[PDB]
A paper describes a structure:
The FGAR-AT protein from Salmonella typhimurium (StPurL) has 1295 amino acid residues and is a single chain protein with three major domains. The C-terminal glutaminase domain produces an ammonia molecule that is consumed at the coupled active site present in the formylglycinamidine ribonucleotide (FGAM) synthetase domain where nitrogen is incorporated into an FGAR molecule converting it into FGAM. While the FGAM synthetase domain and glutaminase domain carry out the two enzymatic reactions within this bi-functional enzyme, the function of the N-terminal domain is not clearly understood.
Five xenon atoms were located using mFo-DFc map and confirmed using an anomalous difference fourier map. However, only three out of them were buried in the core. The other two xenon sites occupied shallow hydrophobic patches on the surface of the protein formed by crystal packing contacts, therefore were deemed functionally unimportant. The first xenon site (Xe1) was found nested in the hydrophobic barrel characteristic of type I glutaminases in the ammonia production domain that constitutes 24% of the total protein. The second xenon atom (Xe2) was located in the FGAM synthetase domain, trapped at the edge of the hydrophobic barrel formed between the two gene duplicated halves of this domain. The third xenon atom (Xe3) was located at the interface of the three helix N-terminal linker domain and the central FGAM synthetase domain. However, X-ray crystallographic studies revealed that none of the three internal xenon atoms were trapped in either of the proposed ammonia channels within the protein instead they were bound to select hydrophobic spaces within. Therefore, it is likely that the compact fold of the protein results in very few surface exposed hydrophobic patches leading to only three internal xenon atoms being structurally trapped.
Residue numbers in the entry: -7 to 447, 466 to 1295
Amino acid sequence: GLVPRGSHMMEILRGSPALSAFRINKLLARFQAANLQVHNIYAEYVHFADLNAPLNDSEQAQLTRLLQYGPALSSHTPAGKLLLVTPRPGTISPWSSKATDIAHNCGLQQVDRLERGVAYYIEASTLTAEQWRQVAAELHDRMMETVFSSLTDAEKLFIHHQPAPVSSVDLLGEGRQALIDANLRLGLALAEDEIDYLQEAFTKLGRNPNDIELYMFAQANSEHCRHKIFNADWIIDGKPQPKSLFKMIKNTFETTPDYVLSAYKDNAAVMEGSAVGRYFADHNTGRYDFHQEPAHILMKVETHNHPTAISPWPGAATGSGGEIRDEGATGRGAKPKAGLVGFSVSNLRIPGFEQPWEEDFGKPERIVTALDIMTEGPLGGAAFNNEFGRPALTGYFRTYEEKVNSHNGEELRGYHKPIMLAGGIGNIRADHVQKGEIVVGAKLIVLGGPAMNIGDFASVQRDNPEMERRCQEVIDRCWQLGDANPILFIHDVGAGGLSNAMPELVSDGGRGGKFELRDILSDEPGMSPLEIWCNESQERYVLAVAADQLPLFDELCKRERAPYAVIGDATEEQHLSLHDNHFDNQPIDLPLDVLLGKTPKMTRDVQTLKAKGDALNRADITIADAVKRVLHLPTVAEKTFLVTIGDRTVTGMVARDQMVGPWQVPVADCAVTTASLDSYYGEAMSIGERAPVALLDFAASARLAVGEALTNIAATQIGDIKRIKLSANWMAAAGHPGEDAGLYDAVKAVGEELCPQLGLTIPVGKDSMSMKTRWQEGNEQREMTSPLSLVISAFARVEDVRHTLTPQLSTEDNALLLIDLGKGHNALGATALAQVYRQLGDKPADVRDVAQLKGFYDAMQALVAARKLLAWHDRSDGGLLVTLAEMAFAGHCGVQVDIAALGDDHLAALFNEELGGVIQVRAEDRDAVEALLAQYGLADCVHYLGQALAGDRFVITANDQTVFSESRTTLRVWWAETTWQMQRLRDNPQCADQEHEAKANDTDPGLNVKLSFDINEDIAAPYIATGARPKVAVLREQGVNSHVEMAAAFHRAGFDAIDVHMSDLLGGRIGLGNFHALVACGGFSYGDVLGAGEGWAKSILFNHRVRDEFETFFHRPQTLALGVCNGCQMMSNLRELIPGSELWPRFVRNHSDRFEARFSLVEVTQSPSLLLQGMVGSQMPIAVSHGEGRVEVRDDAHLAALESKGLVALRYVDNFGKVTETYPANPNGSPNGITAVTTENGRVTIMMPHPEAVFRTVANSWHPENWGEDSPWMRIFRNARKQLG
Ligand SMILES: Nc1ncnc2c1ncn2[C@@H]1O[C@H](COP(=O)(O)OP(=O)(O)O)[C@@H](O)[C@H]1O
Ligand SMILES: [Cl-]
Ligand SMILES: [Cl-]
Ligand SMILES: [Cl-]
Ligand SMILES: [Mg+2]
Ligand SMILES: [Mg+2]
Ligand SMILES: [Mg+2]
Ligand SMILES: [Mg+2]
Ligand SMILES: [Mn+2]
Ligand SMILES: [Xe]
Ligand SMILES: [Xe]
Ligand SMILES: [Xe]
Ligand SMILES: [Xe]
Ligand SMILES: [Xe]
């Protein structure tokens, strides 16, 4: 396959079939649905290699072999009409960046670029050219892809354009008109006074502005970048106001500075953490060690609402990716640890599952549907978190779309433009919290990805998470140098690209800069200087480093394979210049104070609109019907489709994730991580939000968001409320009638009143101020406007991660007690209950009593510390009804509760969404607990409800009357139906159905353990005691992310864990000949492009020296190796080097066709595995996190031979203890539950689950109560140590 392509040659290589049978069946069913009459469809990947020089035979064999990957689906002879789908010309897929990288690291420098498309073969012998266009429309994404008729057309993707010159705007030759034309032509969106400012600036300089200078200015001065609304002066109902919104937020720091180390002067806030062992590999020795020191806590939350309305997968992916850059660029370098995720969208209207409150109102053609956002968006957000390697541990998901009588009268209110929210916490060293001095002469570097023309095609983002992982490793090497950290100053690259980030950086240091345009790394030679300087390409940071640290920085980057460029120098003069060596001229030449000068402050002069509620019309409402609808509201309903798609175990520090208890029910109210791998100190995150309340009462909605963040985090051991710090993220349709006054009133409500009075700081925050959508529907104008939507995220240092309560009810003798901080108001306005009957109602919840909310929190903290709680679940969407139901789902039990003391209105008592929740206590503690609550002023809020009982009965009485009684299993399965329907349409429907149907089986005993050995016996102790510590090579390739906890597991077992990067082996810095033990760690090397683990394995196989090195290590008589997850995939690709491995299977795309992050039950089976000695017959859960873990054999003969040889070491079992292939008990579809195999001599074991994630009991999502510090998985590492003797 090989043809001229300008001054290069393009080779075409056929790949493998691209779609599984159920995917083919969906295409055919959709074609029949549109009646396009299609007899058959078949699809095959095809690869395109643009070559700068020819391949000899052996290089050609290498290239072909690199492009063999993926499940072994049945080939077909091409037949019918070819439609080839590729990335749009002018764009380079992330697949292409990563695959070309593999090619280069396998020695194929002749490969200039690799790209991939899908060839579809459609047999539909009479369709009009018209119907052909609809077939083509159906097979590609119009925002990213194009459809071609010939394989040869792929040459269009590799055209090199000449560099486009700068363009000047003729102000001197045409006057102000030139600026007006450029404003419209370049879409600068400039205000009249901004046009005046530019006109005057350039008249003063006596020369025309260049397009690049105007664009840079336009970006810096957008609402998005300047925050004009948040800095504006206000007049409200005729009275000037004393403070901006930002100054009201700051008020919370003026009033509670406690524990804050950094607020409002960085792209994250920082608060005090805990002195613990920070674990990392020394720069000199490569050995991992604990460094006992403060691990302070940074936090940040951001949105990506507009781009997600256009292209939701990269919109959500880069929302997370951008936020992750903020966290690593805090101070002088910091480390992201865990993430959170939020979505608000309009009604799903799932086909065949439409709910009675949903009405189709239309939408703009150019945006995607709510369903499309909730399909592709969570996948994009998880793709980044999974491929970058941070666990995603808490989040919210709301649907809202209704015609409502609100502040501006009857209007459509919703989320056509969605909220896509991404946030997280990380750790930072004390001495790096402060940005450093920028020395005159400092080198100014771009760290990260080559620029492309990115940033409405302009709203289609692009993510490459692996590129960002490689940058994070360099930032980690830097801060891991302590006082020798060479980062003087670092900033993320986001809006405005370099044109914002570089000026901001020098400016923050009191300097200017001089830059060379042609030093910036670019994958698009056609780009204009404007495009190069201003594009929003992803995975970039800017930093300043002293000239003499450049050789160190260079070494650090090269070992990580993180690209970087020196692109300029910091100057004493406060000027900004950008030179271009190619055109020999100066695209930018400005004083900074001209560039960064501001037009006058905004004034908003506005008036209050307040909705008068309508009383809830109850004609159609019964309690039973209300329970059924409310559990079908996606806001309320089970969230599994948002949770198991995202890793929750990488770092080995996750103590509490969303899934709770033996039945792994996602109801955890907040996330908890341990502060290190050697401590019980930790960090917690929770979310509060209640946007629909803002349709009745702006300030109540903001108070409730703060209050729910607190009730969600309250059963975690924190102590002083001033330890809890908030992000406030404000989404509004600024300018829409009544929203501006409501915004000022809501910010005041929290910043000036509620938070100072509770002792809560808001040291970080952001705002997104055009939350609305307009389009033409008949030839009527239509508009969908969001409620004011405050999202509060709460972050806190944790005193003891072991003491966290979850909603999992005990059935030992117990009391359930409601804490009703609604004080009997029982408001029903703006509840899930109102919304599911198409109403807004009358009067919403609110914070009823500030002393009692603080009293609530302090009481909860006293009960958590004294271990007086069995369970906790707060009340929010769905009310007390949903809180009790979710506790019964998590406990897999019944409730017998009486509500007579809660008012005569049972509907109001069950469904109000007032603050509070239900604690469960031992029956014998009930009196002391009620006395404790009374001491905090709560007696009149506290109500004994009844008890949790074994069994399936969910019973609510009022005196002698049954208010509501149903099977708990029935409610649990209704509550599951949304995630079932989402999984069924997104993933393999067979796996969605199995998962859902297992829920209806009440006899399910949940995760449960059988141990064949003593989990507390440290069999490595006599070896550790001698002080003899053998090395283990902790092997990582670029994109590996689980190596730190892997090293820590081996360390606890007595090893000296050495960081061995593949670059170390390629560069000769490490030899395997010096090791007896090797482990290949997990993650996403090369983003799994070319098959998970393949580029890592082939880069070994195709370098003869490193390959000989691996083969020698494996052939030694006493070496031990382990491969986990990515390392298990890598090693299965290395069988030719491993003796005794001939029967090993391949590991390919899970049968569900979805990444699976699960806490799965396995049994240890009889094999030669030396790492599993003493464990055979044990059954216990383990962390699973993979999308390519399905064992695939050549045929049954290979499966039988593998089995009969006795080499299977681990199998998935269902909770009844049987070997299974039913999902998700077996999360990936592996035959015979196979998930680990060993070699004939037992010296090498590979497995897909992560024992290193869960070797600490505290890091097991569920575990038996009596376990000590060590989980059963700790024994694998101790077995390695004892085996080496
Ligand atoms: N978008 C999301 N991504 C990840 N996890 C989520 C998301 N939405 C909700 N969750 C998790 O699902 C569980 C139930 O969520 P939800 O009912 O919104 O919480 P609550 O009602 O306690 O505020 C929680 O553990 C939450 O963290
Ligand atoms: Cl169709
Ligand atoms: Cl702009
Ligand atoms: Cl939009
Ligand atoms: Mg103090
Ligand atoms: Mg909920
Ligand atoms: Mg909650
Ligand atoms: Mg919530
Ligand atoms: Mn009151
Ligand atoms: Xe190719
Ligand atoms: Xe400017
Ligand atoms: Xe956390
Ligand atoms: Xe108590
Ligand atoms: Xe090992």
